[PDB]
């Protein structure tokens, strides 16, 4: 029993972290096979940040201008190319610690773990969610760029995020491992405001199921609702609309607890309308939305 | 910016996890040098749990009765001894992945990361605190016993906890790596009720400093207090008494933000008396107490 915000074990990703320096800018890189992936803004100088022309800035850079260090040993760069907002630095050595891996582009609401690094060294690991406005609420300081987000299926690490920047509001923006940003953000020091950070409704429902499985049942009401009635309340509270795909995804949680998904929606509706009244659910005073239905099943079943 | 509940990178501990089986009971073991540490209740059968005499049960066990598996390869057990509530299984092979390590016994309020394992394989990592009643609120299912808690100082892993059991209330109990339980708990299936789970006041204050550093300042009031006045309010709200040692420990956070520790105590006092009024601090609707002042400094400075 007990339910925690849990990240994947980070060892497989720790063995991929390298330090990338270009000029006087140092950030993190991800070393998979003989390629090191890093944010292309590693080539930007103090002020280039305002309006960078990456193709132009890259012309003044050769293989020898990218310094890659793995541990305390230097890697030889034999090629470099820009793919969208990431630089791919071909090195002469395949990473001996390369795990089985995939590059995936996740949808909003999906969770992943982040291994926060500085100077190619890991400092910590935490669990995140891709917000519905395509930002992430991470914990990233200067030099954390190039830190990655990932999920693990047994022995296969699926990399889904690479950190690039912090918006003026303190929220974070980044790309998938093909260099495409999540959302409308650009790697440029300009006014970029995020959209509405709505609550991931399917995730809140999964976490309410986790609470029931763990003995926290006080919020269970005597009511039911429909997807249409529930969604009218959800829109009012800045919650994402719930679809029949979400109801289907919650099916195993509904089966395990005997609580129909629409009954849990009605309980959530009452929590939104009445508040918590100073009560807590799984040690939290607000409705948690950074656990997917898959995360609830995984944690509640002990998937290794 | 951003402040997250962050665990230490788990790779160094992942390389120590093994599976230990005795009879029909399988749990996790920690392999450091040529010794495997595991809960001594691995020798208990279905029902022994009620009133086990470990010395007596151990007489019926030889080296060959402890099956240790690291990855998918078997380790040879050449010795076994009981130290308090842990079994130390001497194996013929030193763990090639042994990191620099220490065994430390932590005090209540101290935080650590837990690498939750099943069948010697890691499933997830999360950040915990040793509660003032010597329990931990973890996420542990059947088979998680032998999973460890740890802190990391650069390259030295300090192991502080080993999971042993779940109390009837769903909270967790375990030992340090010398087999001594934290608190009054025993490895026996009996009525063991935990004491008052008070709030770790120094940790709440550290987290209020983290919130100020991260832009969440709405709770900052125009008041100050004394340690004696503050403690009268703290006792009333089931908060741990704050000492001059705690004020000293928060000194760097006070210096960085320019907010005197007693002024932050007065702000905390008003939050206790007035409530949050539907507001949030660092995305939380309650006062977080599982970040030590050291954790706040580490995360806010980027210690690797
Ligand atoms: C990667 C270095 C860094 O820390 N950092 C940053 C990121 C991008 C850029 C470019 C503008 C693309 C050259 C410069 C510096 C910052 C950061 O994002 N600063 C603001 C950039 C403009 O915002 C619109 C950083 C700080 C904290 C966390 N993550 C990144
Ligand atoms: C280690 C196996 C296990 O899952 N487990 C457990 C622990 C200890 C014992 C003894 C009674 C010491 C033989 C048996 C089984 C349980 C657990 O603690 N069950 C209740 C034991 C008595 O409580 C007073 C376990 C389940 C979930 C999380 N952690 C442990």
């Amino acid at each position: 029993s007990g339910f925690r915000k849990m990240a994947f074990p980070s060892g497989k990703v720790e063995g991929c972290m390298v330090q990338v320096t270009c000029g006087t800018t140092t950030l993190n890189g991800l070393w998979l096979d003989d390629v090191v992936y890093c944010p292309r803004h590693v080539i930007c100088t103090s002020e280039d940040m305002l309006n960078p022309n990456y193709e132009d800035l890259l012309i003044r850079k050769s293989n020898h201008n990218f310094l890659v260090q793995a541990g305390n040993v230097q890697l030889r760069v034999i090629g470099h190319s820009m793919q969208n907002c990431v630089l791919k630095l071909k090195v002469d050595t395949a990473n001996p610690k390369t795990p089985k891996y995939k590059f995936v582009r996740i949808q909003p609401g999906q969770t992943f773990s982040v291994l926060a690094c500085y100077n190619g060294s890991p400092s910590g690991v935490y669990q995140c969610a891709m917000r519905p406005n395509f930002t992430i609420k991470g914990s990233f300081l200067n030099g954390s760029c190039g830190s990655v987000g990932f999920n693990i299926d047994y022995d296969c690490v699926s990399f889904c995020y690479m950190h690039h920047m912090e918006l003026p509001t303190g929220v974070h923006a980044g790309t998938d491992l093909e260099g495409n940003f999540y959302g409308p953000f650009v790697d440029r020091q300009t006014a970029q405001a995020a959209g509405t950070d709505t609550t991931i409704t399917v995730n809140v429902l999964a976490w309410l199921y986790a609470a029931v499985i763990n003995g926290d049942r006080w919020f269970l009401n005597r009511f039911t609702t429909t997807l249409n009635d529930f969604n009218l309340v959800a829109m009012k509270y800045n919650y994402e609309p719930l679809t029949q795909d979400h109801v289907d995804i919650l099916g195993p949680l509904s089966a395990q607890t005997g609580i129909a998904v629409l009954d849990m929606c009605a309980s959530l509706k009452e929590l939104l309308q009445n508040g918590m009244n100073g009560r807590t659910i799984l040690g939290s005073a607000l409705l948690e939305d950074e656990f997917t239905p898959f995360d609830v099943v995984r944690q509640c079943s002990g998937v290794t």
Side-chain angles (χ1 to χ4, degrees), chain A:
Chain A
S1 106
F3 202 76
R4 279 276 178 181
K5 181 67 67 48
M6 191 178 289
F8 286 99
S10 62
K12 284 186 181 333
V13 180
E14 284 171 60
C16 299
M17 304 309 304
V18 300
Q19 185 196 60
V20 183
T21 296
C22 186
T24 75
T25 307
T26 293
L27 46 61
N28 308 278
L30 183 72
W31 183 22
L32 296 173
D33 299 323
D34 56 357
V35 179
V36 174
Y37 301 83
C38 76
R40 67 177 178 174
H41 70 247
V42 71
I43 73 178
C44 301
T45 78
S46 48
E47 114 257 276
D48 275 340
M49 42 237 282
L50 288 174
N51 192 15
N53 184 306
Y54 289 97
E55 283 291 9
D56 288 350
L57 286 181
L58 210 43
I59 291 163
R60 317 292 155 200
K61 310 293 189 175
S62 309
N63 289 334
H64 71 269
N65 291 124
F66 297 96
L67 307 173
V68 183
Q69 198 177 317
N72 290 359
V73 325
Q74 209 74 21
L75 298 180
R76 180 176 306 277
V77 177
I78 63 173
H80 69 273
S81 59
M82 180 163 62
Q83 178 175 18
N84 302 305
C85 304
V86 304
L87 287 175
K88 296 192 287 191
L89 310 178
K90 203 198 189 182
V91 294
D92 74 350
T93 305
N95 185 357
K97 302 178 194 169
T98 306
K100 291 165 181 180
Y101 75 89
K102 286 183 168 169
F103 289 168
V104 303
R105 184 178 178 84
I106 62 164
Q107 299 288 331
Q110 303 301 124
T111 61
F112 54 91
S113 306
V114 170
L115 180 66
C117 300
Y118 298 92
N119 299 121
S121 290
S123 55
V125 59
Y126 58 88
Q127 191 73 356
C128 269
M130 175 60 53
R131 304 306 313 171
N133 62 4
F134 295 100
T135 67
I136 80 165
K137 299 186 171 128
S139 176
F140 291 117
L141 308 176
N142 283 129
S144 64
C145 319
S147 295
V148 302
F150 61 97
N151 282 272
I152 310 176
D153 191 355
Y154 174 59
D155 56 2
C156 184
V157 179
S158 280
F159 294 97
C160 58
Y161 180 80
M162 172 167 274
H163 190 54
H164 282 241
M165 64 186 203
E166 183 168 87
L167 301 183
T169 53
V171 305
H172 304 108
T175 71
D176 59 26
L177 274 294
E178 298 174 347
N180 295 122
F181 262 89
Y182 282 97
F185 308 114
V186 291
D187 46 1
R188 169 169 192 253
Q189 186 169 334
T190 192
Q192 302 186 64
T196 311
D197 196 354
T198 55
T199 307
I200 309 145
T201 310
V202 65
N203 288 13
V204 173
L205 288 162
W207 169 89
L208 286 178
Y209 278 112
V212 167
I213 294 166
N214 284 279
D216 243 334
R217 327 163 52 90
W218 69 262
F219 60 88
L220 294 180
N221 70 17
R222 306 180 156 274
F223 323 133
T224 200
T225 185
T226 68
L227 261 189
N228 292 157
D229 174 57
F230 177 79
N231 284 331
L232 290 182
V233 170
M235 167 138 63
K236 166 172 144 67
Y237 282 92
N238 285 125
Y239 264 61
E240 282 294 298
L242 201 73
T243 69
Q244 189 57 45
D245 276 20
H246 298 140
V247 177
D248 294 343
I249 292 169
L250 294 160
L253 294 175
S254 176
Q256 181 178 348
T257 65
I259 298 160
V261 171
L262 289 179
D263 294 6
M264 195 68 85
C265 291
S267 277
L268 174 51
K269 164 179 169 200
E270 296 299 306
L271 283 165
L272 296 174
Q273 296 172 343
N274 311 338
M276 305 275 275
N277 284 108
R279 287 184 293 263
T280 63
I281 294 171
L282 289 173
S284 170
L286 48 79
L287 303 165
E288 294 295 315
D289 76 341
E290 299 202 345
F291 291 100
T292 70
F294 304 91
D295 293 340
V296 172
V297 174
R298 189 184 307 109
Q299 187 171 165
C300 294
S301 80
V303 168
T304 63

